[PDB]
Amino acid sequence: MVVKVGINGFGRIGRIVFRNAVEHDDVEIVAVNDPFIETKYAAYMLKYDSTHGQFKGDIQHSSSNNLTVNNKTIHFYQERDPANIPWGKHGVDYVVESTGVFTTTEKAKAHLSGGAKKVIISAPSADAPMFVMGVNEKSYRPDISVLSNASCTTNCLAPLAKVIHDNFGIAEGLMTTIHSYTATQKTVDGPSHKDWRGGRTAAQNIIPSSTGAAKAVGKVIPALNGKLTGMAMRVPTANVSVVDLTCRTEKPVTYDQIKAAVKAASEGELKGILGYSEDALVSTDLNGDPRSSIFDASAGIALNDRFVKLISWYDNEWGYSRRVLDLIAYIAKVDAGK
Amino acid sequence: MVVKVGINGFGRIGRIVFRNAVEHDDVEIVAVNDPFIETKYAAYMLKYDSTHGQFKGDIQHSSSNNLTVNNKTIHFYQERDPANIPWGKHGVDYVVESTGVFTTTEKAKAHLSGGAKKVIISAPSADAPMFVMGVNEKSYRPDISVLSNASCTTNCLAPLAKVIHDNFGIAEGLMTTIHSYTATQKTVDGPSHKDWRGGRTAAQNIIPSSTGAAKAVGKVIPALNGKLTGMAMRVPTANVSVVDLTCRTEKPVTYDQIKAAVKAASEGELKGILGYSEDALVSTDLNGDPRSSIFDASAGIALNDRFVKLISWYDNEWGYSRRVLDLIAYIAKVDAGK
Amino acid sequence: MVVKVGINGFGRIGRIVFRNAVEHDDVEIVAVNDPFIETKYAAYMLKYDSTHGQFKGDIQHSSSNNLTVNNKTIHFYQERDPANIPWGKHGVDYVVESTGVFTTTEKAKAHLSGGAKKVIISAPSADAPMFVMGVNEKSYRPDISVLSNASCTTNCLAPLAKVIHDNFGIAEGLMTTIHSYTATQKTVDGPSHKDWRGGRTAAQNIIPSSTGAAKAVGKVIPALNGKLTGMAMRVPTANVSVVDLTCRTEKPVTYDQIKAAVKAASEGELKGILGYSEDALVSTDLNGDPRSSIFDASAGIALNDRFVKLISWYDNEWGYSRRVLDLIAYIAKVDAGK
Amino acid sequence: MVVKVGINGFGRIGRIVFRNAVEHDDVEIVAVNDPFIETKYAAYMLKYDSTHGQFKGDIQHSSSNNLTVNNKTIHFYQERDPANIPWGKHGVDYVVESTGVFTTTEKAKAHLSGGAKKVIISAPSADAPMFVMGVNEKSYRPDISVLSNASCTTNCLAPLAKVIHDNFGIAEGLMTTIHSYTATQKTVDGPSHKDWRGGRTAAQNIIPSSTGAAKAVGKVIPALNGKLTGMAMRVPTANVSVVDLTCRTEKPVTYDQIKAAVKAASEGELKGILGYSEDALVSTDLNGDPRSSIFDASAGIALNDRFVKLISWYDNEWGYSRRVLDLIAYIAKVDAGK
Numbered sequence A, B, C, D: 001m002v003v004k005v006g007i008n009g010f011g012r013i014g015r016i017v018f019r020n021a022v023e024h025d026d027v028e029i030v031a032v033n034d035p036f037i038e039t040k041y042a043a044y045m046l047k048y049d050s051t052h053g054q055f056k057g058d059i060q061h062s063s064s065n066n067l068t069v070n071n072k073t074i075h076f077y078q079e080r081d082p083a084n085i086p087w088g089k090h091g092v093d094y095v096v097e098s099t100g101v102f103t104t105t106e107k108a109k110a111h112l113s114g115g116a117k118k119v120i121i122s123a124p125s126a127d128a129p130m131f132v133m134g135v136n137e138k139s140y141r142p143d144i145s146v147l148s149n150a151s152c153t154t155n156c157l158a159p160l161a162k163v164i165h166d167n168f169g170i171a172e173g174l175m176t177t178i179h180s181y182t183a184t185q186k187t188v189d190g191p192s193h194k195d196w197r198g199g200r201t202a203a204q205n206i207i208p209s210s211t212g213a214a215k216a217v218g219k220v221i222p223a224l225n226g227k228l229t230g231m232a233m234r235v236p237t238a239n240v241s242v243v244d245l246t247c248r249t250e251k252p253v254t255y256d257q258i259k260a261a262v263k264a265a266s267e268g269e270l271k272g273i274l275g276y277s278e279d280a281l282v283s284t285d286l287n288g289d290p291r292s293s294i295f296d297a298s299a300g301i302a303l304n305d306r307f308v309k310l311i312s313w314y315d316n317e318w319g320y321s322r323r324v325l326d327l328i329a330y331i332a333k334v335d336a337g338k
């Protein structure tokens, strides 16, 4: 029950994974690596958060490169190469790979040479198996050393798509995610040679963007392979995003049957993963929501019994970070006594 | 060729209609009414615009309630009741009804008692006939005294829907407009009892909202009646919006055939109404664009030869205001020698 | 110890006063009046807040115009005229006047005819006596029926000015408040004939504005009468503001002596009113801060031992609302057994 | 009269210098270097600007690394080391150093080894002489090879300070610049270990920041050495900033005398550098303004005849870029026949 975890990349996801982990007893963070964030600086970035407010616990700078958070010691490193991080020195079993620059199996596996046993990439991967809690975590096997928790958008769309497909079938679906800007964007028009639109002033523009999240649902849900795709629109909010899923079902279904199916799943097998609301929600109301997907019943609309537009919110930082921790706890039980 | 026009409601639409009218010779603005905007105040609101920059022409405060703009005199009024506006005193033939509070035929017809001959409501109407330039203006008849130019969103969606339906048929379509906030929204959480979400902080929220624009296309294009609906997402930008149209076609069509059809229309019968671009556009690039609908070829995506997502921009202020003036000029020729 | 309070104007201040009152046992809210907010709508505006997050307690719609919040019944009214509010029917002793349209003694006194005993205007007043907790509340006398809690800015500047003047003397001071936009501003360029700049797009502009807050300090601190003035700059944030006080002292003083004096007061007589920080704060870090004034030691700067620039934050909604409740509790003890 | 100019760093300043240079005949841009911006990408970043709108001229991609802008060929390079840029190959005499990473004389002088004769650093320098057009350009001597155009803020404050000091004397002054965010800031809370506050979410925060601009005025105006300092507040606007100068004069002066002195200079020796307005301006009204400093007469305020707060706007991108070109043209005439 003592799951020792390390974090590589103390950014938005790394710090919010950290914040949720230290406020609970299911997982212990023992080590953090980030070459661009010194230990005293890390304490400040943890204490003060523009999006999620001040850290509630207690923080102390104990030694040169240690922090004491809630009477627990955490060692910090500044290694640019993951192979140089001594995870095994402190008994790190599971590493959260949240840098954004080690998303392939060949790069992420460098944590294993440092003593780590499992690596969980906090992003989609070109070749590592992807998992979405509540959709396909039971397909995990203990022989898998490098895994992916997919993207925030996939974690929003896949639980919803599972409910719709299981109950009424998805013949075809097209998705738009209206998505808050992120750390990859620019404050003013700047270089983004791999994504020209993505370099434009983040808080002044609606910015079309590509995403693999809808195609990735066809990997976590194989029966939907080739039946979903979509795109993204980056808009001037700093956090919280929303999925807009236009799909044609296989069976006739009313919008009230869709609502009831989602509400049923939200209270049953997908409790804590898929939420259901009928309130007049706006994006700030979902800031800090721990679910992966919050279905907005009153925002969607149906054209007919076969063609519907479904709206589901997600805090792209908070919900996804909790899934990382949920995934770590799940595979920790499988690797031991399941 | 001397079309004398009056404007009721010197707001976003009223001032941008005014700005585009006085910078051309097709239409003469002679009178303006707004009880909440005095004449000296009107000069300042015309000169300085947070969205479209400074007025390029010359402005003078000639008398108590007159302005001289580009050597032309414009009289201003402060009447809360449209029937008390003496349009006929200065020969006003066509009135732009841009207050937002006289959108019914029974209310808008009050301008006729003041000497006006035709009223053009700058919004959808519950009962006045709606027109979209490039789609159904030829259905106008000179016996129509009160008419509507529909909404900005309908003026974006209808020209695009006409091209798609004429070439490949629209079996069904679902639309989302990612829309800049407007004057009906609130700076901070405030009362909006007719639209609870619409009262929430405008520049901090993604705000789902209802819209009749997609159903209204079925009125301007009768063959599409009942085949389109949708919703809106208000986001923290001050101007420029974008339509996201997910539709199933009647005939197999590739995305390249869709691009070519739109580009063809943009250079032919819909020139100046429907635009076509392949550039890496973001919303600020369309600020000041005179078209009603700018198709973004590289932002859309197709799932298959029958299911596509189409993206089209519109400056919800500038393009719509030019259509009002285009509509006035068109019906002025019909009412005289067509 | 049972202070029965009513609220007129269920807006930003009215709802945040309400939220802080019901979460404590010093004051009981029993009645609320707002003609533009129905009872079921009031529950939604209380539950969801774009700035301060979701309401933590429990909310129920008990009858036609009653809410049950934390097992306490609150009656709601929709009266445009304060004299028509039956405060005395439910034993309302103190009324929070937070509409913004009854700031004079002659208008605010209308609550007295409805059964209320004291009225506290949540804004500056042209003639009602103004009070700032920690500065001059001891000058209150039980014969005063209509009083003002001044403005948020005055509540930030006055406690700081008191410390500086008491320790080193203020010979002269000039203040700028960089202030979040508020409900009086517009989402896009709109009519504001009493303040032309104030009508311009709120979240796209730095907007100079007038303020009486610095002169008002000379009323709450009479020795500073005529020695302070200033102005405001409205900027695109939805909450939290900061005072920038440039002053010449009467005695030579180093910046470290200023820091120590403020820190001393923050731990002594001004505890809970004036805060002190040396951290690298930005505006969101002060969201929800209960103090009236949080001195930012590392942000200020001194030119010499007589000329200094002092920086102090304030949550213009949260801190001010707590002062209203603090003021009610103080005068309730004076009106009874002091 | 043929001044051949090169640009190092095709960013905000580099592109806006370029845009203003190619639209005039005083200066010819012949070469550009930026390793992170390819030639085809450079054309797109030039054509579309989120802040200053679309480029008005004509752009063509002529060869592999050439652009044709207004029938003029411009060669582009991708060299990380300035010494590897072959400026002399195309006759580049003057180089605009606008990368932000070569601000010292020892680093900026690397352009000289590539064939360049003069280097103009588009920022303050630790050791290169700084110049402000209209204040001290006549102190330039032809033996100076590496020079600085100071910062945008210094270019706003120095012309104003010169007028005040020349007419009434500045005994002491404290400055705050309310400044738009820039490319050095972050879209969301990110690493900024040299400036902790500067890493926080740019468009959601008021962010205190240090600046040397006020002390730098004491270098361009030696008589003011040690009499001015100040700080900055970064706020959520993408462009346009404003200086707030609180100063004590040496002689009694009314605010009307200050207005008249500034207006006089704006029409005389500082024409085109210092502007004067009495209109109800907000920040967007100054977007694209070519002046270095636009005095806002109605926004400032005086406490007494010796203590005043002065407000002056500046487009931190557009005005500063024009000064770079003005400085190049000035020293080009001095280096030849003055």
Ligand SMILES: NC(=O)c1ccc[n+]([C@@H]2O[C@H](COP(=O)([O-])OP(=O)(O)OC[C@H]3O[C@@H](n4cnc5c(N)ncnc54)[C@H](O)[C@@H]3O)[C@@H](O)[C@H]2O)c1
Pocket (backbone or CB within 6 Å): A008, A009, A010, A011, A012, A013, A014, A033, A034, A035, A036, A037, A079, A080, A081, A098, A099, A100, A101, A122, A123, A151, A152, A182, A183, A184, A316, A317, A320, D189, D190, D191
């Ligand atoms: N932000 C979101 O909403 C979100 C949601 C889901 C997944 N993700 C994914 O999580 C990853 C991180 O995203 P983010 O928003 O937290 O980014 P971020 O930029 O906020 O954080 C990345 C962190 O990595 C650190 N880092 C950089 N190079 C490093 C190295 N060589 N070794 C160690 N640390 C290094 C940086 O200093 C920074 O602290 C990306 O793959 C992203 O796509 C992001």
Ligand SMILES: NC(=O)c1ccc[n+]([C@@H]2O[C@H](COP(=O)([O-])OP(=O)(O)OC[C@H]3O[C@@H](n4cnc5c(N)ncnc54)[C@H](O)[C@@H]3O)[C@@H](O)[C@H]2O)c1
Pocket (backbone or CB within 6 Å): B008, B009, B010, B011, B012, B013, B014, B033, B034, B035, B036, B037, B079, B080, B081, B098, B099, B100, B101, B122, B123, B151, B152, B182, B183, B184, B316, B317, B320, C189, C190, C191
């Ligand atoms: N803003 C857009 O993007 C947009 C686009 C298309 C259509 N429209 C429609 O145009 C109308 C106006 O929209 P807007 O954004 O310009 O609104 P706005 O609030 O900016 O302007 C409305 C104007 O009407 C004036 N007014 C109010 N009552 C009046 C009265 N009794 N008599 C005369 N004038 C009066 C107001 O003072 C204000 O100047 C609405 O119907 C709106 O839906 C708006």
Ligand SMILES: NC(=O)c1ccc[n+]([C@@H]2O[C@H](COP(=O)([O-])OP(=O)(O)OC[C@H]3O[C@@H](n4cnc5c(N)ncnc54)[C@H](O)[C@@H]3O)[C@@H](O)[C@H]2O)c1
Pocket (backbone or CB within 6 Å): B189, B190, B191, C008, C009, C010, C011, C012, C013, C014, C033, C034, C035, C036, C037, C079, C080, C081, C098, C099, C100, C101, C122, C123, C151, C152, C182, C183, C184, C316, C317, C320
């Ligand atoms: N917002 C701030 O930061 C702040 C800080 C300190 C003081 N204040 C002062 O508090 C007052 C309210 O400010 P706010 O920001 O809460 O405004 P707001 O517009 O958010 O709220 C005002 C409320 O008054 C209600 N109201 C209007 N007319 C009414 C009437 N006749 N009877 C009853 N209720 C009525 C409105 O429906 C609304 O709910 C103003 O005087 C303001 O200057 C505001």
Ligand SMILES: NC(=O)c1ccc[n+]([C@@H]2O[C@H](COP(=O)([O-])OP(=O)(O)OC[C@H]3O[C@@H](n4cnc5c(N)ncnc54)[C@H](O)[C@@H]3O)[C@@H](O)[C@H]2O)c1
Pocket (backbone or CB within 6 Å): A189, A190, A191, D008, D009, D010, D011, D012, D013, D014, D033, D034, D035, D036, D037, D079, D080, D081, D098, D099, D100, D101, D122, D123, D151, D152, D182, D183, D184, D316, D317, D320
């Ligand atoms: N932005 C303003 O308002 C402003 C005003 C006045 C002065 N300045 C100064 O101008 C400089 C640039 O500021 P900016 O806002 O344009 O920054 P920016 O980040 O927008 O542009 C900097 C450019 O430099 C390029 N670059 C980086 N390394 C390079 C290298 N080794 N060789 C060549 N090019 C390289 C980058 O790719 C980028 O295009 C800074 O010194 C800044 O302080 C900025």
Ligand SMILES: O=C(O)[C@H](O)[C@@H](O)[C@@H](O)[C@H](O)CO
Pocket (backbone or CB within 6 Å): A124, A151, A152, A153, A154, A177, A179, A209, A210, A211, A212, A213, A214, A232, A233, A234
């Ligand atoms: O799946 C992915 O790649 C991401 O989650 C993606 O959907 C978002 O980060 C963004 O909106 C795409 O630009």
Ligand SMILES: O=C(O)[C@H](O)[C@@H](O)[C@@H](O)[C@H](O)CO
Pocket (backbone or CB within 6 Å): B124, B151, B152, B153, B154, B177, B179, B209, B210, B211, B212, B213, B214, B232, B233, B234
């Ligand atoms: O057609 C309409 O009603 C409007 O144009 C509408 O689409 C927009 O104004 C908004 O996005 C809907 O809330």
Ligand SMILES: O=C(O)[C@H](O)[C@@H](O)[C@@H](O)[C@H](O)CO
Pocket (backbone or CB within 6 Å): C124, C151, C152, C153, C154, C177, C179, C209, C210, C211, C212, C213, C214, C232, C233, C234
């Ligand atoms: O004292 C006052 O009048 C206000 O508090 C005032 O300072 C602010 O509301 C605003 O910044 C001024 O426009």
Ligand SMILES: O=C(O)[C@H](O)[C@@H](O)[C@@H](O)[C@H](O)CO
Pocket (backbone or CB within 6 Å): D124, D151, D152, D153, D154, D177, D179, D209, D210, D211, D212, D213, D214, D232, D233, D234
């Ligand atoms: O002079 C300087 O250093 C800069 O111009 C400076 O004033 C601004 O860039 C910013 O507001 C300071 O953080």
